[PDB]
Design a protein around this ligand. Structure first.
Ligand SMILES: O=c1[nH]c(=O)c2nn[nH]c2[nH]1
Ligand SMILES: O=c1[nH]c(=O)c2nn[nH]c2[nH]1
Ligand SMILES: O=c1[nH]c(=O)c2nn[nH]c2[nH]1
Ligand SMILES: O=c1[nH]c(=O)c2nn[nH]c2[nH]1
Ligand SMILES: [K+]
Ligand SMILES: [K+]
Lengths: 300, 300, 294, 294
């Protein structure tokens, strides 16, 4: 392996081109993004056989400084005319490989920095502010893009993924976990009504990469819509495990978005413990640190 | 000094008594709390001259185990019949001092664990879920209560404060910081239009402690309403500094809530830097770690 | 209340004047600091009645920008000729009030950024490097200073404290917690041999503020020495509670350092649960606050 | 993909069998581990075709609860008779696949929880305590193991790696970064003497998996020794980049440990900005990934 790059390249700008013309689904009122305030955190990693002597000899002749990669990313947000985080990564990647022809591969991760609308009273009228936004530390959209320059000097995307990260959902009732193996290592009691608390990271892969860029926005799959499917499916279903929940969420995603090839889940179990004192309302509290987790792919 | 206690006592319960009958203000649509899902993180600290030998001699005869304080808090959330985090602390404090008459002082901090409504589709109807909630890592309500047992064995509250913590607001334009001292230590340029990013922690003190408990809920001041004043005032005003912004927020709070005696601000400045590369849309990025801060009290 | 300032002002300096000639105590090998690499994280807060209109009117005419406070701190680490973090805060505070006559009060917190030595081979000899250091995220020295300008324009120290923060100590045996109140709320079993795991913040106040500056280094009390007293006392004693442990640590500190007026403790209990094998507990943690005076 | 498991399974054990008889190298004093106190944080992941219906139908009949995996790990630390974190993972993996025939693959990550010795006075003599240890939040040993059940029911190790994580090293001088591309996007000045601050994660693979278990301790490679090689090489060399530094560290590791097949580096650049006085940079950090093979 031989890669180098820059992480935590934050970039914020106002008045990105709005995302509109999206295709709606029953589970979500999402209708687009006004993009008055946009933020992204980018990680860039590059490689190429011509970088060998920067490691073996200390020869920096062909090294793009990682500080310069930071400048490159931030400058390209200023000139980006598109509407999605996926399209921004494609713009950066194509531009970078065209600039530096000795680079054979670039990998980009983009994580949206989400902001929420606030309201203000102007002359007796309370209405959405175009100026003041709340920074959110909750869920956010993500994107991943890898691109190569082939031996014949043509350029190709080699992996593209979109995602939703940081979603934390608790369902207070309507969840069971029963019927699991009870042997000499089992101290977990059967529970026909637990308050299941799941962390969800969800990623999806398009059949056609062009659909990820917003160029024809009716074919875009928004992380907001995926989020809203997840919350609806969790509500609708008596869950039998996190495994079965994420299967059902994935099936619903692929049914709603036939342009997707597959969907990938990383879930964690953070369910609260019943308190020690006997019960009045039932009371729960934080568990010990060990957390369950699941990784699962659903394909068309 | 001589105190001991328990921190990070989390307690979650469903169907706390709803908060309704609140008094509205122009800046906020807040109309109450449904309390289907309630969470709080409590810190308890106690003291008393009779605890001396637990330090000086290792005699635990009069020590309430901190684990037992945790049990006490969690059990009392199960039996609490009120509607506010302030009233919950009062219930815990009065009950604890009545149980343990050798304790002379108790200090409680409560931090709400906020949850946000989600939506689900049931038989074609998309509507607020009573089951699935999103855990929020954004702003949250707080409460502080100190109570003593006097030498004559009567009980009194000795300090009570309510608050809002973790509010992060960015205003993209309509902020200036000019006219400050320019001397041999000054490298900051004058800026007539900066994207001011402030962290706000806001605390308030009632004239009459009973108004904090929800018993007559029209006299309650909700952290939600304080939040909404802060966002409105930030929008309405060309800011001249964070100092002047928090003064104006405080004045508006005290005007809207004449039952409050004073309001206290802890603010931090986290404003982004303009990027190094020249500009296309202007682009900003994260600053170096040093952050400005302000502490300020406004009184009636 | 009316204060403003800057937090997280980091400053890293090479070749500060070495701290030497400190009095060594039996609990600790500490005998000074080479100061090849010295880092500090400073928080500055200032106030004064003449700042009122910066809040009430948006008038910045008397505002020292917090960014300029950051520059002031960093520049003064470059010019500081002393040997201790306490002396550095004194230098910053005096310098700042002398520079800005409208400031009536300044409060400073300094946290040392600790570095540890590393091994290098030089001509076959393994020894501590003079060039390569390891950044530590464990315990660290602290200092606190509040200074005011009086109406007669004299400057006065109103608060001064030194400290050790972030010390995490576990003793595998020789600890009990028994005899506490058992009632309707008690589920904790009595335990005659627990692996007590304590977090310790320890603060001390000098009888004579001059002793904190290193001017006469025989009178300086190093956070390293306080750490080593804490571990020695923890080892020596069959503990009966965290309360009684911190009492005994504090008594030893005051006995070893008669120039100290008081010691202050903030402890937390992070003892593992028994499943011998132990594991991490649930989040609630016990804590204690306690002062011993000379 | 179809896996599930448990993360953050902490387990703390006293008096593990000591690691002794290790081969010492010139860069490091390391000569074993007393193992009075031993902590590990384990992540377990398992899979198998027979788990399909636990996802597709909600049938838990073949689900080992992740809580039970936690119990399994913790109990096996109590019964483990070996001397290394790599050997502990092997014991857990073999034991788990032998217990649960429907599991076809298991992946384990183990992170050592590092403790440091402390000073105590015993009858006037200051010495390392056998009872009181300091919890360290600095660098730590790691191990990784993947094991599968074949169709003929043999068990096979498919991946195995050891590591050192969280090493943070700053070298005050003797580092350059010059000669890189300067174009429209370059604002970074050339620097002939920077205080290079690197974070290092270092991983290695043995030629013979048996060497990782400590069974023959002369062949074990301790994370402590890798750390000390890293600091020695950093010291010895006028660095020309992080890229070239990690190349030289890796070459020295493979020379000192011919039983190793490869070394892998994940480095990050956290060098301070110059305001001599330096300060913390803005958040963006450089990083490098690089493998050296024997
Ligand atoms: O949903 C769950 N899946 C699991 O595998 C599991 N194991 N313990 N609890 C659990 N809950
Ligand atoms: O609003 C501000 N107040 C201040 O005191 C300050 N100092 N630098 N920038 C600043 N901005
Ligand atoms: O040392 C202790 N002090 C306490 O107050 C306490 N309470 N529970 N466990 C405890 N341990
Ligand atoms: O060691 C370095 N390698 C790099 O690639 C680099 N880029 N900017 N600074 C750097 N330093
Ligand atoms: K719309
Ligand atoms: K209502």
């Amino acid at each position: 392996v031989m890669y180098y790059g820059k992480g935590d390249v934050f970039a914020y700008r106002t008045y990105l081109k709005p995302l509109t013309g999206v295709r709606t689904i029953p589970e979500s009122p999402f209708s687009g993004r006004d993009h008055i305030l946009f933020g992204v955190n980018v990680k860039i990693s590059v490689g190429g056989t011509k970088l060998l002597t920067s490691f073996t000899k200390g020869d920096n002749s062909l090294v793009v400084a990682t500080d310069s990669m930071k400048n490159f990313i931030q400058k390209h947000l200023a000139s980006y005319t598109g509407t999605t985080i996926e399209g921004f990564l494609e713009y950066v990647a194509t531009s970078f490989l065209k600039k530096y022809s000795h680079i054979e591969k670039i990998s980009l991760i983009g994580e949206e920095i989400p902001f929420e609308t606030t309201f203000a009273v102007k002359n007796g009228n309370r209405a959405a502010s175009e100026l003041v936004f709340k920074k959110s530390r909750n869920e956010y959209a993500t994107a991943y893009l890898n691109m190569v320059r082939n031996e014949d000097n043509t350029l190709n995307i080699t992996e593209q993924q979109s995602g939703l990260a940081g979603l934390q959902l608790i369902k207070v009732s309507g969840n069971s976990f029963v019927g699991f193996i009870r042997d000499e290592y089992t101290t977990l009691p059967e529970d026909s009504n637990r308050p299941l608390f799941v962390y969800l990271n969800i990623k999806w892969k398009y059949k056609n990469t062009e659909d990820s860029f917003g160029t024809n926005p009716e074919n875009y799959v928004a992380a907001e819509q995926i989020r809203d499917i997840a919350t609806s499916v969790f509500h609708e279903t008596e869950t039998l495990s996190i495994q079965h929940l994420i299967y059902l969420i994935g099936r619903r995603i692929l049914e709603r978005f036939p342009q997707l090839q597959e969907v990938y889940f990383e879930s964690q179990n953070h369910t609260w413990d019943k308190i020690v004192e006997e019960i009045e309302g039932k009371v729960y509290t934080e568990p010990r640190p060990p957390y369950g987790f699941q990784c699962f792919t659903v394909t068309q």
